Design a protein around this ligand. Structure first.
Ligand code: HEC
Ligand code: HEC
Ligand code: HEC
Ligand code: HEC
Ligand code: HEC
Ligand code: HEC
Ligand SMILES: CCCCCCCCCCCCCCCCCC(=O)OC[C@H](C)OC(=O)CCCCCCCCCCCCCCCCC
Ligand SMILES: CCCCCCCCCCCCCCCCCC(=O)OC[C@H](C)OC(=O)CCCCCCCCCCCCCCCCC
Ligand code: SF4
Ligand code: SF4
Ligand code: SF4
Ligand code: F3S
Lengths: 929, 169, 45, 104, 157, 261
């Protein structure tokens, strides 16, 4: 409770030397990129005045055509995270940077007498050209040094299955522009994977249902765990994940591949799925693809190319190129190769750059105890991870918005990582750290970055290239060229083993938290996991069949014992899941993540094996718990007969025969309450639920943009999550194998808004532009408006929801004290709500006002693509489309005329301003029934 | 220290956009940096205790902590460059800055004053060219001349301009 | 919610026990009537 | 609901208005077996007056509810009875049914 | 009275900061970064033959001098330069008479043969005594419009 | 009762300081005990005026003994019901915004929401059932003053009973002021728990938009209210020796009006 007769004397500090580019009060977007798995995503970040505020996709980048990921969106909080490392630590004791260079260059001179024998490095699957080129200088200045690449989720099998089927290593580039039939076994390709944004848009661009569409992608998915690809999957099949490895062997025998030698008979329903898929891939041969996820063994990815090249997809859909990353022979096998070298004391200088393997170890590779058997073990990470607890040195991280580096996306399009801000704490990124090891410490990151690109630029001048490389970000001059392949057969000649019986633990990365490197990110943790709306919890998902067998509920706490190691995990029954198998999420139980992901339980990394690192059939469940919180946001996961108001579904079998087959013909509803005219801009939105794969990137995009506060798990279980936009899974019918549909629910900006007539002080009123205006300051916290809101979109700041993972909201001694590091990630044109103030999806008025005012200043009108809401230009699939409804040539008023257009709860005349499109899901004739 | 009297500085012919450059282009009318003040005071009255605070801000990297006199509550989201573009001169909100040795509030920023011109802009809207002319006294017929400038500028109605989203975004 | 509702009966009985002790817990002149009204009806009978 | 209740509050106006009507036609022609006490005629007048207030309490609250949240299933009643000339009989209910016999 | 959201945990276009050494909340741009709208490598955005800092300057103004731009130049010259170079360009501004190496008037043979590049170079980077402008103009259209008006001030000595 | 008040002022000091979210109210159900107890506590107070005011219309005499023990029961059931709409708001300090006042910013309360009619029903119900209760006391506080025989106690009631004096004309002005106030507190409490009824019936919710809420919330307030009148009079009849005034016929008739409701 703050009170004063006068607000304090707010100061106005100008610059000391204002840059020629900073106009105070204007976004000034930059062009950088983010190493997700070594591959770039090509960002375009809002740099208000030196500091970044909001991360957006660079529309010129191939890995993100203007829309970002879920992790990639919330990585503006990972930077403005008060738990980020602020100074190097020598043996736990905080120390200076120049003290590290004194003891790092002294180790190089001790690693020079010996010909660089103990200078092992544990970076994680880097594709950066300037980091590769400094890896080259480090391995020739020290010839015996080795560089082990270990990413816990990266292409360990797909890169070892590419050279298992082709000889040398290749880097496949799947293209879904021309792909009528996708059959991706365990393929979570619309996932946080490096190609996840493009493979979500190129797959959505095939299922753009319009007034006259007749051909749509099919996407047969075959996956044990329900995933964000299974939403767009039209025939998803819950498989054990031990049958996938011989479910592709069955498809590679229907399609004619010579020596597959399939085995382990499939099923009555898994076989009917593999005949209908193969009979669908033999048709439209040139326009099809057979994807394979990462969980599968390398012999399956070898068959993924044995079928793709058999259907003639090479050169058309699947394109093999030079490997973008430096060495694809690293990963689980390179981590064990180094750990066996850290044992017996061969390693003397171990620079673990960003891998964090003390946490990410498969629990068979004993990296935790192999560490400290070395004399000097460095680390350069933005968080003091579980390695920094055990390593000697720990250099600060220099998060990618503060580091002068580069990336190389898929297909090789390098993007110069562009530091928006100078590092909040002295950064010393992976390039500024190898400069210490190479012997050039005082040479900054930007100096080596151009000292490498001046060599790689032979065409024309440099400042006409370097600044053009910095402006677009995309250099697109190092495009990974194609490579002729051979597909040497006989790789599947080895017979499949005897099928093992027992419950199977399938290891999966968490959609939101990929591999635990972002566990302290409160935004992508509060964000509900896609199918199970849990927020702050890692669970053991089971199908309803394989939990009624064990007598398990949605709240018990089982003890997953897989090959001797027990984990004591919760349980959450997931209807779409597969029989006799559980899944796990990678990256939750972190002893030293920070203050956010510090004790979110169930570290699933301590159950792997490094021989069965993605799925294994030796699990014993044996429940040892009774009750757990398991804060999930949704509540009821069933369409309780309320179709026509929730996500309406159909099929293309009955859409070509009747376009308006789910648009109910209703007369003009009588409305006593007047009628207002909006002759200005009529701001409306048209969501296409056919392509909403629950990526949850729009959930974080509304958090990064609208200063939405994180809530603790203790208050999300109470149903007090602040999320102006939410995606709703609904699980229609047949709880063993249910179809799942999304209706992304936000504030419909109702013209006859019932939530407005019910505010006593008249806080929430409508607009002359046509959108419900929530006024956070006139809100006295009556909270009645939500009770009148039919959709329950309005969220209420019950307690002082602000910096909540860093200060528990149930206190009030610090509720007026704000974290100074967090005050920068907040949008400078959205109100940071106090407690007792309701909020809702305001169509991003912070973007409508700043653009209308720029239009009225210039005496012109708003262009159709000028006002993109935060959730519209972040959705990879481009489901959300926002724009003027009065502008007749707009992509919304030409999108609200589709035969699938409907509004939620039209039985009560709210005149919702968002109008969802139905989910037409292209069922096969000979596979449905 | 020194205080920066506007009356002495504008009297040198400074057209009010020398400093405050971000007006008429951005939402926030900027305060000039140390380089602007040191643009002249590097040799105008350097080595004087009245101006030794921009030198203390120029040698040291610290920026000047100007006390804000027009202090809106940060949930209101004022926007210059649309009042300056729709013919609302620098007076009538800031008062005669040319006669201000120390800047003080003249209009108390009530929201009964912001809505008073949003509900009725014709009482204060002036020509676009005479916006940075602080000697502008409204004519005896301010209405039916400001009424005529409303259609000339297409300034929106009292229904579109006072609806909780203009301010309070 | 419990410590406010069950405490609301405190604010009810804090005032209701003050009213009993300070003020007449039952009307006096209205009970002076219905006594004058009972004798007025007993007068005829 | 309260559609059968807005009749009940109007069943009590007719039987009380008719009670004063029938007691007057019987007293104007001198047919009553008892002279109407002027204080108990004031009781029938207080009942008649209190039930024009209850009738206006049940008809308006039936409208104030359906008008406020205009769910198009409850709306067609007051929607058809407020347009096309039925609003003339609607504004009579507000003024000639309540406000005129409430002030009188 | 209640200051609930009067001061919010976010950095508006200008207000003090409690994290950085010079409390600014407006951090300096990193030295060699290029924004999305600010490329500045051609003869237009910088007055050099191909954008090279070791270039040869531009003799004619690159942008097309439309008649509505000279009134934008004469209005922008009257704002920035006229306070210290004089309204008519003869270096007799009210502040110019008080600078010790007094601003050089135009209409002298040294500044007529001086190319539009220098007139733009000092308008963006300043001189040995004139502090750098271009963070005040901040727009290439008005940056060359000022040079256009000074190009037409010299049309009547 | 005072230790119950220290729990009241501490559950309020914890609510004002920590927040309105220490109540377990979710986002679907944002209205929990704070409004269940508001409608309940104000519902209790409605059958204290049906005894004191609505029965004065019917000139009935089983209301005289139970008059003040129910009329004073209303006020203290409004003093505990008039706090929840002032405290269930997330920002209680800005509860003056629900009042119409020229306030240097052109905002006024809405006057389309029943939380804005509540602050006009609760505030009227308070300052009318207080005045009609203080009206019913000036003759009694004149009886307490004349029978006190204790200076500074006779002065206390002599100050509350302003100058009552009895009076032939002062009693006629009282009989018309008490009849009209009874004739005004009959449509008041028929509307106060009808306006409180309308903060559910103006919402489009399925269980809330039931149109018969006004003549059923009022019927519920008279129902729960007489229960509280009986709960507070069986002890006042037994412990306080008022067997000669609150006779069993009062409970026989209160049990019937509690049944007719
Ligand atoms: C050139 C256009 C100037 C700019 C830019 C700034 N100032 Fe200035 N200032 C200028 C002159 C010609 C004078 C008077 C010269 C003299 O001999 O007095 C001043 C004076 C001041 C003063 C002192 C006022 C007084 O009455 O003595 C102060 C405190 C001052 N100036 C402050 C100041 C600041 C803060 C500036 C940056 C916004 C600034 N000046 C710029 C000329 C110019
Ligand atoms: C540089 C010499 C300036 C000129 C020319 C103008 N202004 Fe200014 N202004 C300047 C500074 C350094 C400051 C902050 C110092 C202070 O005393 O506040 C200001 C401030 C204002 C303000 C108030 C800002 C606030 O803190 O709320 C106003 C309203 C203002 N200035 C108006 C204004 C006008 C109308 C001008 C043209 C005559 C003008 N300024 C010119 C620097 C300079
Ligand atoms: C009424 C519509 C105004 C007009 C016309 C001008 N100004 Fe303004 N000014 C106004 C307000 C309500 C505020 C405070 C709002 C806030 O959040 O800051 C200001 C403030 C300034 C400032 C300081 C801004 C800051 O430091 O944050 C300056 C420098 C300023 N104003 C300058 C200025 C000039 C030069 C104007 C004429 C073109 C002018 N203002 C007009 C309200 C209004
Ligand atoms: C009369 C002198 C005014 C005062 C006092 C305030 N404003 Fe204003 N404003 C005025 C005009 C003539 C206009 C142009 C409207 C148009 O559509 O052209 C404006 C505009 C704004 C805007 C932006 C309009 C939009 O389309 O979003 C904003 C955000 C705004 N004004 C804010 C604002 C505030 C906060 C004020 C009180 C401190 C205020 N204005 C006062 C005229 C006048
Ligand atoms: C620009 C003309 C505005 C419009 C349109 C609206 N508001 Fe406003 N508001 C504006 C200003 C300049 C201020 C500051 C007043 C002050 O005392 O400094 C305000 C303030 C408020 C407040 C007070 C908030 C507080 O914490 O005390 C409220 C409650 C408020 N405004 C409400 C409100 C509503 C509901 C509006 C749309 C119907 C609205 N305002 C429009 C400027 C402007
Ligand atoms: C007072 C602060 C000035 C302002 C405003 C402008 N100029 Fe300037 N200028 C000033 C000085 C003190 C000098 C002398 C430079 C030196 O050698 O000491 C100058 C010089 C120039 C020149 C000539 C440079 C040369 O080497 O011959 C040019 C072409 C020039 N100035 C241009 C210019 C423009 C375009 C301005 C408006 C943005 C401007 N000046 C303003 C002082 C001041
Ligand atoms: C009684 C309800 C009347 C509503 C008045 C609202 C005042 C709320 C308030 O001022 O709290 C603000 C402050 C932060 O809150 C606080 O500082 C704590 C206030 C404690 C109040 C304890 C006493 C209750 C009221 C008597
Ligand atoms: C239970 C209550 C509701 C009853 C039912 C409804 C009937 C309501 C009848 C009208 C009463 C409404 C009261 C609303 C008061 C709002 C004033 C306020 O809150 O100011 C806020 C601010 C913190 O304060 C300020 O900005 C200034 C603070 C100082 C002045 C405070 C004035 C308060 C009034 C008391 C007067 C005391 C004398 C003051 C003397 C000078 C003090 C400095
Ligand atoms: S609408 Fe939301 S859930 Fe759907 S694709 Fe876009 S961001 Fe993802
Ligand atoms: S959809 Fe909900 S939040 Fe949006 S205007 Fe309607 S009632 Fe309000
Ligand atoms: S429009 Fe913006 S604020 Fe509204 S729901 Fe979408 S992302 Fe969130
Ligand atoms: S109804 Fe009214 S005042 Fe606040 S939270 Fe809900 S708006």
């Amino acid at each position: 409770c703050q009170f004063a007769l006068k607000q304090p004397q707010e100061k106005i500090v100008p610059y000391v030397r204002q840059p020629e580019e900073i106009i105070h009060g204007r976004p000034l977007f930059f062009a950088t990129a983010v190493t997700f798995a070594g591959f770039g995503v090509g960002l375009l970040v809002e740099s208000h005045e030196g500091r970044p505020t909001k991360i957006e996709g660079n529309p010129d980048h191939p890995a993100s055509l203007g829309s970002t990921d879920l992790i990639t969106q919330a990585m503006i909080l990972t930077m403005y995270d008060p738990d980020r490392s602020q100074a190097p630590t020598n043996a736990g004791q905080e120390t200076t940077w120049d003290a590290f260079v004194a003891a790092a260059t002294a180790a190089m001179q001790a690693q020079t007498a010996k010909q660089g024998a103990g200078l092992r490095v544990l970076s994680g699957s880097l594709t950066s050209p300037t980091l590769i080129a400094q890896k080259q200088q480090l391995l020739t200045q020290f010839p015996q040094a080795k560089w082990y690449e270990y990413e816990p989720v990266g292409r360990d099998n797909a890169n070892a299955g590419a050279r298992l089927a082709f000889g040398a290593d290749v880097h496949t580039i799947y293209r879904l522009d021309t792909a009528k039939v996708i059959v991706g076994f365990d393929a979570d390709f619309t996932a946080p994977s490096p190609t996840g944004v493009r493979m979500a848009r190129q797959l959505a661009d095939g299922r753009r249902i319009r007034k006259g569409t007749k051909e749509v992608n099919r996407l047969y998915l075959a996956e044990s765990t329900p995933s964000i690809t299974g939403l767009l999957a039209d025939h998803r099949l819950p498989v054990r994940s031990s049958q996938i490895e011989h479910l592709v062997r069955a498809l590679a025998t229907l399609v004619g591949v010579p020596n597959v030698a399939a085995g382990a008979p499939l099923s009555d329903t898994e076989k009917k799925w593999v005949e209908a898929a193969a009979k669908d891939l033999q048709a439209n041969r040139g326009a099809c693809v057979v994807l394979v996820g990462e969980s599968q063994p390398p012999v399956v990815h070898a068959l993924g190319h044995a079928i793709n090249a058999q259907l003639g997809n090479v050169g058309s859909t699947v394109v093999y190129t030079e490997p973008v990353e430096d060495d694809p022979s690293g990963g689980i096998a390179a981590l064990s190769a180094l750990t066996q070298e850290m044992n017996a004391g061969t390693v003397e200088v171990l620079l673990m750059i960003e891998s964090n393997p003390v946490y990410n170890a498969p629990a068979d590779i004993p990296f935790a105890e192999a560490l400290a058997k070395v004399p000097l073990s460095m680390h350069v990470g933005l968080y003091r991870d579980e390695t920094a607890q055990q390593s000697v040195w720990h250099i600060n991280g220099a998060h990618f918005l503060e580091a002068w580096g580069d990336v190389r996306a898929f297909d090789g399009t390098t993007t110069i990582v562009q530091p928006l801000i100078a590092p909040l704490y002295n950064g010393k990124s992976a390039i500024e750290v190898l400069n210490v090891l190479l012997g050039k410490p005082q040479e900054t990151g930007y100096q080596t970055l151009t000292a490498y690109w001046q060599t790689q630029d032979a065409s024309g001048n440099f400042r006409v290239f370097w600044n053009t490389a910095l402006h677009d970000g995309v250099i697109t001059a190092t495009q990974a060229r194609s490579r002729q392949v051979t597909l040497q057969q006989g790789f599947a000649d080895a017979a499949p083993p005897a099928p093992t019986q027992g419950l199977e633990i399938v290891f999966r990365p968490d959609p939101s938290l990929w591999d635990g490197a972002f566990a302290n990110n409160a935004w992508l943790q509060e964000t509900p996991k896609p199918y199970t709306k849990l927020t702050w919890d890692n669970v053991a998902l089971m199908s309803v069949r394989t939990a009624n067998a064990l007598g398990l509920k949605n709240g018990d706490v089982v003890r997953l014992t897989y090959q001797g190691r027990s984990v004591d995990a919760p349980v959450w029954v997931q209807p779409g899941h597969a029989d006799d198998s559980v899944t796990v999420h990678f990256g939750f139980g972190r002893t030293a993540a920070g203050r956010v992901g510090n004790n979110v339980g169930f570290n699933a990394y301590r159950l792997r094996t490094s021989a069965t690192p993605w799925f294994g059939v030796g699990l014993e469940v044996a429940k040892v718990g009774e009750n757990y919180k398991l804060a999930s946001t949704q509540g009821h996961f069933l369409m309780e007969g309320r179709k026509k108001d929730l996500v309406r579904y159909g099929t293309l079998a009955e859409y070509v025969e009747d376009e308006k087959f789910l648009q109910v013909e209703k007369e003009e509803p009588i409305s006593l309450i007047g009628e207002y005219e909006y002759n200005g801009y009529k701001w409306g939105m048209s969501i296409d639920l056919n392509v909403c794969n629950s990526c949850n990137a729009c959930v974080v995009a509304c958090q990064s943009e609208n200063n939405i506060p994180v809530v603790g798990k203790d208050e999300v279980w109470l149903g007090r999550e602040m999320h102006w936009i939410r995606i709703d899974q609904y699980y229609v019918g047949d709880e063993h194998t249910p179809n799942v549909y999304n209706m992304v629910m936000l504030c419909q900006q109702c013209e006859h808004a019932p939530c407005e007539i019910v505010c006593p002080v008249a806080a929430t009123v409508h607009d002359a532009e046509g959108l419900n205006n929530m006024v956070y300051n006139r809100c006295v916290g009556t909270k009645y408006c939500s009770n009148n809101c039919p959709y329950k979109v309005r969220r209420f700041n019950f307690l002082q929801y602000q910096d909540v993972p860093y200060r528990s909201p149930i206190d009030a001694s610090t509720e007026n004290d704000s974290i100074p590091v967090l005050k920068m990630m907040r949008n400078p044109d959205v109100t940071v709500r106090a407690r007792g103030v309701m909020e809702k999806c305001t169509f991003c008025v912070q973007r409508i006002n700043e653009a209308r005012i720029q239009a009225r200043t210039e005496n012109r009108r708003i262009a159709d693509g000028e006002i993109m809401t935060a959730c519209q230009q972040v959705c990879p699939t481009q489901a959300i489309v926002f724009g003027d409804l009065n502008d007749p040539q707009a992509r919304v008023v030409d999108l609200k005329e589709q035969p699938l257009k409907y509004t939620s709860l039209d039985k009560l005349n709210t005149k919702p301003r968002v109008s969802y499109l139905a989910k037409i899901k292209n069922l096969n004739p000979d596979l449905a029934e | 220290g020194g205080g920066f009297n506007h009356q002495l500085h504008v009297a040198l012919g400074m057209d009010c956009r020398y400093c405050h450059t971000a007006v008429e282009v951005s939402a926030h009318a900027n305060i000039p940096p140390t380089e602007t003040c040191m643009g002249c005071h590097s040799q105008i009255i350097s080595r004087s205790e009245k101006v030794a605070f921009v030198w203390q801000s120029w040698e040291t990297g610290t920026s000047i902590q100007w006390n804000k006199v027009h202090d809106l509550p940060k949930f209101v989201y004022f926007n210059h460059s649309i009042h300056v573009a729709k013919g609302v001169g620098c007076s009538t909100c800031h008062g005669r800055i040319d006669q201000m040795r120390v800047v003080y509030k003249t209009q108390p920023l009530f929201m009964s004053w912001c809505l008073d011109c949003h509900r009725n802009p014709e009482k204060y809207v002036r020509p676009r060219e005479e916006v940075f002319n602080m000697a502008w006294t409204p004519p005896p017929n301010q209405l039916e001349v400001g009424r005529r400038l409303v259609q000339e500028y297409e300034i929106r109605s009292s229904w579109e301009l006072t609806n909780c989203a203009i301010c309070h975004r | 919610d419990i410590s406010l509702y069950a405490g609301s009966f405190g604010w009810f009985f804090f005032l209701f026990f003050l009213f009993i002790r300070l003020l007449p817990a039952i009307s006096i002149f209205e009970v002076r009537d219905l006594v004058h009204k009972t004798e007025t009806e007993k007068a005829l009978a | 609901s309260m559609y059968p209740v807005t009749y009940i509050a109007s069943m009590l106006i007719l039987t009380f208005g008719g009670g004063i009507i029938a007691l007057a036609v019987l007293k104007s022609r001198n047919l009553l077996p008892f002279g109407i006490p002027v204080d108990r005629l004031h009781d029938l007048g207080k009942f008649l007056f209190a039930f024009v207030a209850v009738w206006a309490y049940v008809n308006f609250s039936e409208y104030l509810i359906i008008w406020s949240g205009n769910v198009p299933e409850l709306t067609p009643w007051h929607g058809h009875r407020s347009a096309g000339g039925w609003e003339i009989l609607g504004i009579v209910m507000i003024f000639g049914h309540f406000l005129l016999p409430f002030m009188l | 009275c209640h200051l609930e959201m009067y001061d919010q945990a976010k950095y508006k276009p200008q207000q003090a900061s409690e994290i950085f050494a010079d409390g600014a909340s407006a951090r300096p741009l990193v030295e060699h970064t290029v924004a999305r709208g600010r490329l500045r490598i051609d003869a237009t955005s910088t007055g050099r033959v191909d954008g090279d800092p070791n270039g040869a300057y531009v003799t004619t103004i690159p942008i097309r001098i439309t008649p509505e731009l000279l009134e934008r130049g004469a209005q922008r010259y009257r704002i920035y330069c006229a306070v210290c170079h004089g309204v008519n360009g003869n270096g007799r501004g009210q502040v110019g008479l008080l600078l010790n190496p007094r601003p050089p008037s135009f209409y002298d043979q040294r500044l007529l043969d001086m190319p539009d590049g220098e007139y733009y170079d000092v308008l963006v980077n300043g001189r040995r005594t004139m502090y750098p402008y271009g963070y005040r103009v901040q727009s290439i259209s008005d940056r060359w419009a000022i040079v256009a008006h000074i190009r037409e001030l010299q049309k009547n000595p | 009762a005072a230790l119950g008040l220290l729990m009241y002022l501490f559950s309020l000091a914890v609510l004002f300081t920590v927040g309105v979210g220490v109540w377990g109210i979710n986002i679907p159900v944002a209205w929990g005990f704070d409004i269940i107890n508001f409608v309940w506590w104000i519902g209790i107070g409605h059958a204290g005026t049906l005894i004191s005011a609505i029965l004065l219309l019917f000139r009935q005499d089983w209301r005289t003994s139970i008059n003040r023990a129910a009329e004073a029961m209303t006020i203290f059931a409004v003093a505990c019901a008039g706090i929840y709409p002032l405290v269930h708001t997330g920002r209680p300090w800005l509860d003056y915004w629900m009042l119409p006042y020229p306030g240097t910013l052109g905002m006024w309360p809405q006057f389309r929401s029943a939380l804005e009619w509540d602050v006009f029903a609760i505030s009227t119900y308070a300052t009318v059932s207080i005045l009609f209760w203080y009206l019913g006391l000036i003759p009694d506080l004149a009886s307490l003053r004349d029978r006190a025989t204790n200076i500074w106690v006779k002065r206390f009631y002599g100050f509350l009973a302003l100058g009552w004096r009895g009076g032939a004309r002062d009693w006629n002005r009282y009989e018309v002021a008490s009849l009209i106030l009874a004739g005004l507190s009959t449509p008041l409490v028929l509307s106060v728990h009808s306006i409180i009824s309308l903060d559910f019936a103006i919402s489009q919710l399925p269980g809330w938009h039931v149109t018969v809420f006004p003549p059923y919330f009022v019927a519920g307030a008279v129902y729960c209210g007489f229960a509280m009148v009986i709960l507070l009079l069986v002890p006042l009849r037994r412990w306080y020796k008022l067997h000669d005034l609150i006779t069993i016929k009062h409970f026989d008739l209160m049990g019937k009006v509690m049944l007719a409701s």
